Design an enzyme around this catalytic site. Structure first.
Site, short mmCIF file in Angstrom:
data_model
loop_
_atom_site.label_atom_id
_atom_site.label_comp_id
_atom_site.label_asym_id
_atom_site.label_seq_id
_atom_site.Cartn_x
_atom_site.Cartn_y
_atom_site.Cartn_z
N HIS A 68 36.60 43.48 31.77
CA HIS A 68 37.76 42.62 32.16
C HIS A 68 37.63 41.24 31.53
CE1 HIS A 68 38.48 45.79 35.21
NE2 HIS A 68 39.74 45.51 34.87
N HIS A 72 39.84 42.59 26.33
CA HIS A 72 40.82 43.39 27.12
C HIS A 72 42.20 42.71 27.09
CE1 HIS A 72 42.58 45.85 30.19
NE2 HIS A 72 42.71 44.81 31.00
N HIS A 106 47.00 38.61 32.22
CA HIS A 106 47.14 39.53 33.38
C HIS A 106 45.82 39.66 34.15
CE1 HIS A 106 45.28 42.69 31.00
NE2 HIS A 106 45.12 43.35 32.13
N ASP A 107 44.69 39.36 33.53
CA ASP A 107 43.37 39.51 34.20
C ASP A 107 42.57 38.19 34.18
OD1 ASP A 107 43.06 42.11 35.38
OD2 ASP A 107 42.56 43.01 33.43
N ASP A 217 47.92 48.24 30.20
CA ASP A 217 46.64 47.94 30.89
C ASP A 217 45.65 49.10 30.74
OD1 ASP A 217 44.99 46.22 32.29
OD2 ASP A 217 45.77 46.86 34.27
N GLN A 269 36.53 61.01 35.04
CA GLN A 269 37.49 60.69 33.95
C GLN A 269 38.65 61.71 33.94
OE1 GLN A 269 37.02 57.54 33.56
NE2 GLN A 269 37.50 57.78 31.39
C1 LIG Z 1 40.91 52.62 31.41
N1 LIG Z 1 40.46 53.21 32.63
C2 LIG Z 1 40.55 52.54 33.94
C3 LIG Z 1 39.91 53.53 34.87
C4 LIG Z 1 39.23 54.50 34.07
N2 LIG Z 1 38.62 55.46 34.84
C5 LIG Z 1 38.91 55.13 36.17
C6 LIG Z 1 38.52 55.79 37.34
CL1 LIG Z 1 37.59 57.20 37.20
C7 LIG Z 1 38.90 55.26 38.59
C8 LIG Z 1 39.67 54.09 38.71
C9 LIG Z 1 40.06 53.42 37.55
O1 LIG Z 1 40.81 52.28 37.78
C10 LIG Z 1 39.71 53.91 36.25
C11 LIG Z 1 39.45 54.20 32.62
O2 LIG Z 1 38.98 54.74 31.60
MG LIG Z 2 43.69 43.62 36.57
ZN LIG Z 3 43.67 44.66 32.89
#
Ligand SMILES: CN1Cc2c([nH]c3c(Cl)ccc(O)c23)C1=O
Ligand SMILES: [Mg+2]
Ligand SMILES: [Zn+2]
Length: 313
Positions: A68, A72, A106-107, A217, A269
């Site tokens: 973050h 990003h 945004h972050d 995002d 994932q």
């Molecule tokens: C880009 N993103 C964001 C994100 C990934 N994997 C996540 C899991 Cl397993 C739970 C909650 C999340 O916000 C994410 C990822 O690759």
């Molecule tokens: Mg954010």
């Molecule tokens: Zn973000």
């Protein structure tokens, strides 16, 4: 007035593509953002002196966290740039201005921890903003930087245009709260399917801009597999740190966030691609057909995570 940013030939061509990676040279990222603003908006949109001072104050207010971070911010702005360029006539002058700035901001001042961790910690920000905790903080930080002397890139807008752009930016940044994405997309799905979606309805535009914000995002899942795979390490480095801090509060973290359960990541994932990413880019592709390459790239990466699980990498 006659000062254009140009990029080397390979960047000038690849920056137009959704899957562009902004590279490891941090000192080129401000130039990449100004280049995108000039082509997306115009060379007149912002006083270049004020824009450069704004960019550098935004950079300074991003922290040295694994994911973050300032990279990003510029990555999410680039995805918005690619959506706007492929949907030239669907967006107003104010929206193109507002959304690139919204993505860059945004972050702002992210510490690498979720809204949930702030609430369990009992962080002061959780008392100040009961929902979308970090996102209300990111919008607050944005307004603070706009009000520094010489940083008001919007100063040449009329009073009502100024209020409109700050409202576009606020909604856009709040929409990056993934807790709000699920309901936003369900509503957009229903509206698209019953044929009631109407882009002249402001409440409808707001919803579509929110989905664009979610799509930008999450755009790490739409890169070529080697970028996606290496970014996922940075994402999990913050998740495991948060997991560690949950254990210090005497709370067992969800297995995704527990660095003792790394084996469960690939399945984690898959849930994320299937529950969030694929549905997000599918609805986005339905509403804005030229964003299809984000959905295709996301499906390709889903397939690469399936290969990781099957032990083929
Ligand atoms: C880009 N993103 C964001 C994100 C990934 N994997 C996540 C899991 Cl397993 C739970 C909650 C999340 O916000 C994410 C990822 O690759
Ligand atoms: Mg954010
Ligand atoms: Zn973000």
């Amino acid at each position: 007035g006659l000062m254009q940013f140009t990029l080397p030939v390979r960047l000038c061509k690849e920056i137009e593509l959704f899957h562009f990676d902004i590279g490891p040279f941090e000192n080129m990222w401000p130039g990449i953002f100004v280049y995108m603003v000039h082509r997306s908006c115009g060379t007149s949109c912002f006083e270049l002196e004020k824009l450069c001072r704004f960019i550098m104050s935004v950079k300074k207010n991003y922290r040295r966290v694994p994911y973050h971070n300032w990279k990003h911010a510029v990555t999410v702005a680039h995805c918005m740039y690619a959506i706007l360029q492929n949907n030239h006539t669907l967006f107003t002058d104010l929206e193109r201005k507002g959304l690139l700035i919204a993505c860059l901001c945004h972050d702002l001042d992210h510490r690498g921890f979720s809204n949930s961790y702030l609430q369990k910690f009992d962080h002061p920000l959780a008392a100040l903003y009961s929902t979308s905790t970090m996102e209300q903080h990111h919008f607050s930080q944005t307004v603070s930087i706009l009000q520094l002397e010489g940083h008001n890139i919007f100063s040449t807008l009329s009073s009502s245009e100024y209020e409109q752009v700050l409202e576009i930016i606020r909604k856009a940044i709040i929409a990056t709260d993934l807790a709000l994405y699920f309901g936003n997309r369900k509503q957009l799905e229903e509206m698209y399917q019953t044929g009631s979606l109407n882009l002249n309805n402001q409440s409808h535009r707001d919803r579509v801009i929110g989905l664009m914000m979610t799509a930008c995002d999450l755009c790490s899942v739409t890169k070529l597999w080697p970028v996606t795979k290496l970014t996922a390490n940075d994402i999990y480095a913050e998740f495991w740190a948060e997991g560690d801090e949950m254990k210090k509060l005497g709370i067992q973290p969800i297995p995704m966030m527990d660095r003792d359960k790394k084996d469960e990541v690939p399945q984690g994932q898959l849930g994320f691609y299937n529950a969030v990413a694929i549905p997000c880019y599918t609805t986005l592709t339905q509403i804005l057909p030229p964003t299809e390459p984000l959905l295709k790239a996301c499906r390709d990466n889903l397939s690469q995570w399936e290969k990781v699980i099957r032990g083929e990498e």
